[PDB]
Point group: C2
Chain length 1011, copies 2
C-alpha cells in the first residue's frame, strides 16, 4: 500500500488525540501529580536493525528478533548511534521534490522490544501504547500482528493494544521510515534525523473512562472573580449512576468542587451530548498566572459512581489568565505584554533531537536569568514536559504546528492545494487537542515558512472556533495575511524597509501604520545570532518601548545546532553542515544561537539580558529614577546597589531597597559625594540585585544594570620633566632610538616599527603595521561561497576591492630630534591594481619619559567599500597570563553591540579574551578602552582592541575552531575605529550606516609605554 | 585661556610650535586645546588641533579658531558646500563646488543678529592673499561674534576694521523643530569629548 507515499493516509487505527492522561486510580496522587502505576514507561534498551529500504526488511523480524540487531537506548535518533548520517539542509529539501513520493532508498529503522504485561491489565480495561515522537512515519506490529501506522513526527501516536497482548512476555515491532509524504511538511531549517526519539509508554484506562477534558477560565472586568469551566467527555457505557467531580486546589487547600452526572445541555434539534458534562466552579479573587508570577492551581477530574467508588482520575495544572487582543494590543490579564522572547529548537549536541528534563530545565533557567519571558516552539509541538516546565516556571509560549514546506516553489504550493488540507489539518488539530489546557500556551501558530495558502485560512478559522481563548498567528505569505491575528514578520528591520515583491518586509515602525492596519506586531524571528552577531539589538528594544503596538519578538535563536564528533585521538569537536558527508548542506547556518550547544553563553546573551531588563533608569543630579516594566508584581525581591568610581577606582557605594509597583517609579536620592582627589572621569553604575533565591535564580542574582558618566575633571597638569633625552641613531637601513634600557627600531625601507627591546629582550615577532581588514564574521560572509559568490556581501566587496591583498607603499619616513624627544614621521599608501585605497600618516614621538606617542591620520578613498577597521597590529613576543584594561567589559563587545558592557577596570586570563565561535572569525574585541596592560606593556588612548594567540589570517583561513593552533607570541589588534558586526539577518548586509566607517578621514592616537 | 605649554623646536626644514591651553571657569576646566604649528621652507603653516571637552559641560556651540584679519577684500572664493549659508543640520540643499561671491553675500542679514553665514564641508578657502585648506566650516564678515551677540537689530551693526574669520573644525546644529525648547538633535550636538582638526594656512 505504500502508505508513506500518500498524503491521504496519515494514520491507520490511531486513537484520538487528547490532553496528557495518566489514569490515576487514587485521587490524591492525581492532585499532587505523583507517578501513576497505570502509566508505564517503555523507554530503555530496545533491539534495532537498520536497512536501506523497507523492501529489505525480512519477514522473520515480525515474529522473531534478528540476530544481527543491536541493543540500543530508546528514545534516540539513529544517526546519533552512527547507523547513517544526519543531514543539515536549510531550505532545499533533503530529498527530490516530487510529492508525494520519496526515494526508493529510504533508510528504515527496525525497532523491537520484548516486554512483560501483567494479567491485571488484560483482565479488564484498555491497554494502549503511546509513541510521543517517531520521525517520520512508522508501522507497528504486536506479537506478529499488524496494529497500525502513523505520521507527524512531533505529536504522539497512540494505539489500542488490548486485543493484541497476552499476559507475560510480548514483542513489539516498529518499522520506522526516514522519509515519507509527511517529510514534505517537515522542512524546518535543522538537522534531518529519524527514529523513535521521544518517549514510549503504555497506559491502562478503564473501559468506562475520561476520554477528553477542556479547562477554561473566564473573568469579570477587574479579574477579581473567575469561573472555571471544565467540559468532560467519556467513552464506555453510559449509566445513570456515573458521575464526574471536578475539584480545584491551590496548594493543599481545596478552593472549589462540583459534581454532576453525564448529560450536556441541548446543542441542536437532535439534543445534546449525553456523553459529556460541563462543571462550572466560581473562584473569588483568584491568584492569576503570568510569566512574572506563575501562580497555579490543580484541577482534578474524577470519574466515579454515585455511591462513591472512583473509576479513574485525570488532572492538570491550571493557570488563571486571560489572553486577548483589544484595540490593537495583545493583553494578558488586561495588561499589554512586552514579549522578551526567543525561538528554541529541541537540540542536544550528543543526543540529537531527544530532549531530557535536565536540559529543558537548564534552558528555562538560563532564559529567565537572562530576562526572557517567552518562547516560540520553532517549528513544531514540543516534548510534553516542556509545557509543564513553562507552566510552572513561568514563560509565555507560542505552540506551533509541525508544518513547514519552505523548499516548495512557490512556497505555498502544498498549502494552497486542498488535497494537502487533511494532512495539514491533523498537524494543527491534534496539537490543539493535546495542549489546550496549558496556561503557558498563550498563542497558537499554524506552522512556519509554508507561504500562505487557503488551507491556512481554513485552519486559522478552525482554531478560532474551537478555542477562542488564544490568538492565532502565522507569518507565511507576508506576515500580515488573513491567517494571522498578529503582524509577525521575521527579520524585519527597525527603520529600514526591504520592499521585496509580493512579500515586502517593511520597517516594523512603518508596518504598524500602513493604511487600514491595526494589529499588534511581535516579530516571530528577529536578530539572527549566528556567530559574532546581535549588532543593532538595542535598536529593536528602543523601538519596542517607544511604540505601544510593537510588543516585542522572538530572537533567532536559543542554541546552536552543532553536533559532537570525535577526532582520531578521540577528542570531541563541534560540527556543522557537511561534517557528516551530508550534501548538499548549508554549512554553518545551523548555528544561530545565543548559547553554544553545550549551553555555554555566547557574548551576545549578555546584550539580550541588558536590553530585556524589567527596570529602566534615569538620572537627574543625584536622583536616580527607577521605573518598573513589570505588569503584575511589585519589586519584592530587589534592592539597588550603586557604585561610583574614578577611572575604575572605587570612591563610594551603597544599597537602597527597591519598592516599585508594576509600571510605577521610585525616586532615589544619592548622598553627596566628596570631590574626588585626582583628575579623571567619575562613573556611576547601578545594579538591581535579588537578595533571595527563587525557583529560577540564586540569591544575589543581578537582573538589571546601567551606568552614567558623572563629573569629569580634565587633567591640566604638566608632567614631571624627563630626567633624560632619547638618542637617535640614523643608518641607511634604520632609524634607532635609545633611552636607557629601551630601544626602538624603525625600518627605513618598510617605514614601520620593526623591533623593540627592553634590556636584551626583543618585544616583537612581527612589526607594528596598519590593519584595515578583519577575519570575516558570519554576517560579513552571508550566503557567499567559493562556488557561488554573493558580490553584495561585505566580504566580497572587500575582497574585490583588494582590501585583503593591498600592499603598503612607503611614501615617506623621516627622523627629527626635538628638545626632549625623537620624532619619526611616516606615510604609506595601500594600493590595489593601480588604485590607492588608503593613506596612513603617522608620527611617533619618543620622549625622555620612555613613552612612545603614536599619532595616526588615515584617508580612505570615498569609492572603496568602507573598511572593516582602522587600526594597527603586531605579534608580541610574549605570552602573559592576564589582560587588564580600563574600558568596556568584561565580555566581548563591538560598536553596535556594546550596551551591556560597562566601563570599569577589568582583569581576565588571556584565554577569556578569545571567544571560541565554532566557525572562527574576528572575535574578542573590547571597545571604549582608555588603557590596556599586558606583560610589561601599557597602551593608552581611546581605542578598541583584541588580543589572543590567533592571527587574523589564521582565523580567516580556518573554518572550525578545533583546528586552530596557538601561534608564537600574542597577536594584538588595536583599532582606532571598528565597523559594526550587524545581525538583523545573516544573508544580506546588515550593518547600519551609523556603524560603517565612511567618514573618509580618521584620526587616532596611542601612547605605548612600559609598566 | 590658561596657558599650559608653549614650546618651539627647530627642525630639518621647519619650525614647530607646540601649545596647550585650558579654559576654566570658577575652577572648572571646560576645554583643553593642544596644538602644533609647523611652518616650513615653503611658507606654509600647518596647524593641528586636538581638543578635549569636559563630559559634564554643556556640549559647545563650535570647536574652531577665530581671528580678525587686517585685510578687507571684495571676494570670497571657496571649494566646499554652497553657495548659500549652510549648517550641519541644514546643508542638504547646498552643493559641493567652487563658489565665488562678494564678501557681503557671506553675511546673512537676519533682523535679530546672530551667528550666520557659515558654509560647511569646505576644503579650501581664499580671501585676499590668504588660502586655508583642510576640511572645515567657516564664516567670514565684517562683524565679530561679540558684536552680533550684543546687537539686537541688524540696522545697528557697524562694519569693524578688517575681516572676522571663524574657521571651525566642528559646529553644532542650529535646530528649529521649535524655537522655545532645545531642538538640536543629538547627532548634531558636539558630544564626542575629543575632537581633531587640521588646517594649512598659506599665502596665494
Ligand atoms: O538560519 C537560517 C535562516 O534562513 C532564513 O532564510 C534565509 C534566506 O534564504 C533563502 O534561501 C530564502 O529563499 C530567503 O527567502 C531566506 O530569507 C529563514 O527565513 C530562517 O527561518 C532561518 O532558517
Ligand atoms: Mg501517508
Ligand atoms: Mg501504588
Ligand atoms: Mg507467553
Ligand atoms: Mg525554513
Ligand atoms: Mg552547500
Ligand atoms: Na511596545
Ligand atoms: Na539556521
Ligand atoms: Na524590594
Ligand atoms: Na574563519
Ligand atoms: Na544678537
Amino acid at each position: 500500500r505504500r502508505d508513506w507515499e500518500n498524503p491521504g493516509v496519515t494514520q491507520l487505527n490511531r486513537l484520538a488525540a487528547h490532553p496528557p492522561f495518566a489514569s490515576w486510580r487514587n485521587s490524591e496522587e492525581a492532585r499532587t501529580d505523583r507517578p501513576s502505576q497505570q502509566l508505564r514507561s517503555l523507554n530503555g534498551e530496545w533491539r534495532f536493525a537498520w536497512f536501506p529500504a523497507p523492501e529489505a526488511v525480512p519477514e522473520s523480524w515480525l515474529e522473531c528478533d534478528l540476530p544481527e540487531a543491536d541493543t540500543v537506548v530508546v528514545p534516540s535518533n539513529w544517526q546519533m548511534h552512527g547507523y547513517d548520517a544526519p543531514i543539515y539542509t536549510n531550505v532545499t529539501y533533503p530529498i527530490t521534490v516530487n510529492p508525494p513520493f520519496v526515494p526508493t532508498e529510504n533508510p528504515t529503522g527496525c525497532y523491537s522490544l520484548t516486554f512483560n504485561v501483567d494479567e491485571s491489565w488484560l483482565q479488564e480495561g484498555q491497554t494502549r501504547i503511546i509513541f510521543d515522537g517517531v520521525n517520520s512515519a512508522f508501522h507497528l506490529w504486536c506479537n506478529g500482528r499488524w496494529v497500525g501506522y502513523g505520521q507527524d513526527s512531533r505529536l504522539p501516536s497512540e494505539f489500542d493494544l488490548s486485543a493484541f497482548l497476552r499476559a507475560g512476555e510480548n514483542r513489539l515491532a516498529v518499522m520506522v521510515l526516514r522519509w515519507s509524504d509527511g517529510s514534505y511538511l517537515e522542512d524546518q531549517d535543522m538537522w534531518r534525523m529519524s527514529g523513535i526519539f521521544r518517549d514510549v509508554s503504555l497506559l491502562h484506562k478503564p473501559t468506562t473512562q475520561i476520554s477528553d477534558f477542556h479547562v477554561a477560565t473566564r473573568f469579570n472586568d477587574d479579574f477579581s472573580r473567575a469561573v472555571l469551566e471544565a467540559e468532560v467527555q467519556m467513552c464506555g457505557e453510559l449509566r445513570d449512576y456515573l458521575r464526574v467531580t471536578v475539584s480545584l486546589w491551590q496548594g493543599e487547600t481545596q478552593v472549589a468542587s462540583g459534581t454532576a452526572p453525564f448529560g450536556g445541555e441541548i446543542i441542536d434539534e437532535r439534543g445534546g451530548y449525553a456523553d459529556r458534562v460541563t462543571l462550572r466552579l466560581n473562584v473569588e479573587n483568584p491568584k492569576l498566572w503570568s510569566a512574572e508570577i506563575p501562580n497555579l492551581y490543580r484541577a482534578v477530574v474524577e470519574l466515579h459512581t454515585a455511591d462513591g467508588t472512583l473509576i479513574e482520575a485525570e488532572a492538570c495544572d491550571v493557570g488563571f489568565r486571560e489572553v486577548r487582543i483589544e484595540n490593537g494590543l495583545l493583553l494578558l490579564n488586561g495588561k499589554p505584554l512586552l514579549i522578551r522572547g526567543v525561538n528554541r529548537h529541541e537540540h542536544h549536541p550528543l543526543h540529537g533531537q531527544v530532549m531530557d528534563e535536565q536540559t529543558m530545565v537548564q534552558d528555562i533557567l538560563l532564559m529567565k536569568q537572562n530576562n526572557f519571558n517567552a518562547v516560540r516552539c520553532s517549528h513544531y509541538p514540543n516534548h510534553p514536559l516542556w509545557y509543564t516546565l513553562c507552566d510552572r516556571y513561568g514563560l509565555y509560549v507560542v505552540d506551533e504546528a509541525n508544518i513547514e514546506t519552505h523548499g516548495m516553489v512557490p512556497m505555498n504550493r502544498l498549502t494552497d492545494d486542498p488535497r494537502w488540507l487533511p494532512a495539514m489539518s491533523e498537524r494543527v488539530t491534534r496539537m490543539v487537542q493535546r495542549d489546550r489546557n496549558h496556561p503557558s500556551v498563550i498563542i497558537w501558530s499554524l506552522g512556519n515558512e509554508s507561504g500562505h495558502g487557503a488551507n491556512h485560512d481554513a485552519l486559522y478559522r478552525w482554531i478560532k472556533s474551537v478555542d477562542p481563548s488564544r490568538p492565532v498567528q502565522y507569518e507565511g505569505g507576508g506576515a500580515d495575511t488573513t491567517a494571522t491575528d498578529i503582524i509577525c514578520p521575521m527579520y524585519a528591520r527597525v527603520d529600514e524597509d526591504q520592499p521585496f515583491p509580493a512579500v515586502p518586509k517593511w520597517s516594523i515602525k512603518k508596518w504598524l501604520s500602513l493604511p487600514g492596519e491595526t494589529r499588534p506586531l511581535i516579530l516571530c524571528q528577529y536578530a539572527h545570532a549566528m556567530g559574532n552577531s546581535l549588532g543593532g539589538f538595542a535598536k529593536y528594544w528602543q523601538a519596542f518601548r517607544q511604540y505601544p503596538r510593537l510588543q516585542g519578538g522572538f530572537v533567532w535563536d536559543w542554541v546552536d545546532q552543532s553536533l559532537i564528533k570525535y577526532d582520531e585521538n578521540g577528542n570531541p569537536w563541534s560540527a556543522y553542515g557537511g561534517d557528516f558527508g551530508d550534501t548538499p548542506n548549508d554549512r554553518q547556518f545551523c548555528m544561530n544561537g545565543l548559547v553554544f550547544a553545550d549551553r555555554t553563553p555566547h557574548p551576545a546573551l549578555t546584550e539580550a539580558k541588558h536590553q530585556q531588563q524589567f527596570f529602566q533608569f534615569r538620572l537627574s543630579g543625584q536622583t536616580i529614577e527607577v521605573t518598573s516594566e513589570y505588569l503584575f508584581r511589585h519589586s519584592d525581591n530587589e534592592l539597588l546597589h550603586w557604585m561610583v568610581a574614578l577611572d575604575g577606582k572605587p570612591l563610594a557605594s551603597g544599597e537602597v531597597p527597591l519598592d516599585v509597583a508594576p509600571q510605577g517609579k521610585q525616586l532615589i536620592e544619592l548622598p553627596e559625594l566628596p570631590q574626588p582627589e585626582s583628575a579623571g572621569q567619575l562613573w556611576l553604575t547601578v545594579r538591581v540585585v535579588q537578595p533571595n533565591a527563587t525557583a529560577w535564580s540564586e540569591a544575589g542574582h543581578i537582573s538589571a544594570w546601567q551606568q552614567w558618566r558623572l563629573a569629569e575633571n580634565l587633567s591640566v597638569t604638566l608632567p614631571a620633566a624627563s630626567h633624560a633625552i632619547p638618542h637617535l641613531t640614523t643608518s641607511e637601513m634604520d632609524f634607532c632610538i635609545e633611552l636607557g634600557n629601551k630601544r626602538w627600531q624603525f625600518n627605513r625601507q618598510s617605514g614601520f616599527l620593526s623591533q623593540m627591546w627592553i634590556g636584551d629582550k626583543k618585544q616583537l615577532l612581527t612589526p607594528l603595521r596598519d590593519q584595515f581588514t578583519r577575519a570575516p564574521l558570519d554576517n560579513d560572509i552571508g550566503v557567499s561561497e567559493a562556488t557561488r559568490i554573493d558580490p553584495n556581501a561585505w566580504v566580497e566587496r572587500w575582497k574585490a576591492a583588494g582590501h585583503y591583498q593591498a600592499e603598503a607603499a612607503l611614501l615617506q619616513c623621516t627622523a627629527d630630534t626635538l628638545a626632549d624627544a625623537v620624532l619619526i614621521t611616516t606615510a604609506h599608501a595601500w594600493q590595489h591594481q593601480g588604485k590607492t585605497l588608503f593613506i596612513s600618516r603617522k608620527t611617533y614621538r619618543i620622549d625622555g619619559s620612555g613613552q612612545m606617542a603614536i599619532t595616526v591620520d588615515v584617508e580612505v578613498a570615498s569609492d572603496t567599500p568602507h573598511p572593516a577597521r582602522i587600526g594597527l597590529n603586531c605579534q608580541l613576543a610574549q605570552v602573559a597570563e592576564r589582560v587588564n584594561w580600563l574600558g568596556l567589559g568584561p565580555q566581548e563587545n563591538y560598536p553596535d553591540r556594546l550596551t551591556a558592557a560597562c566601563f570599569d577596570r577589568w582583569d581576565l586570563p588571556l584565554s577569556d579574551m578569545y571567544t571560541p565561535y565554532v566557525f572562527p572569525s574576528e572575535n574578542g574585541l573590547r571597545c571604549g578602552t582608555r588603557e590596556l596592560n599586558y606583560g610589561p606593556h601599557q597602551w593608552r588612548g581611546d581605542f578598541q582592541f583584541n588580543i589572543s594567540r590567533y592571527s587574523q589570517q589564521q582565523l580567516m583561513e580556518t573554518s572550525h575552531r578545533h583546528l586552530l593552533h596557538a601561534e608564537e607570541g600574542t597577536w594584538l589588534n588595536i583599532d582606532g575605529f571598528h565597523m559594526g558586526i550587524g545581525g538583523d539577518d545573516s544573508w544580506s548586509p546588515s550593518v547600519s550606516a551609523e556603524f560603517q566607517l565612511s567618514a573618509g578621514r580618521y584620526h587616532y592616537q596611542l601612547v605605548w609605554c612600559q609598566k
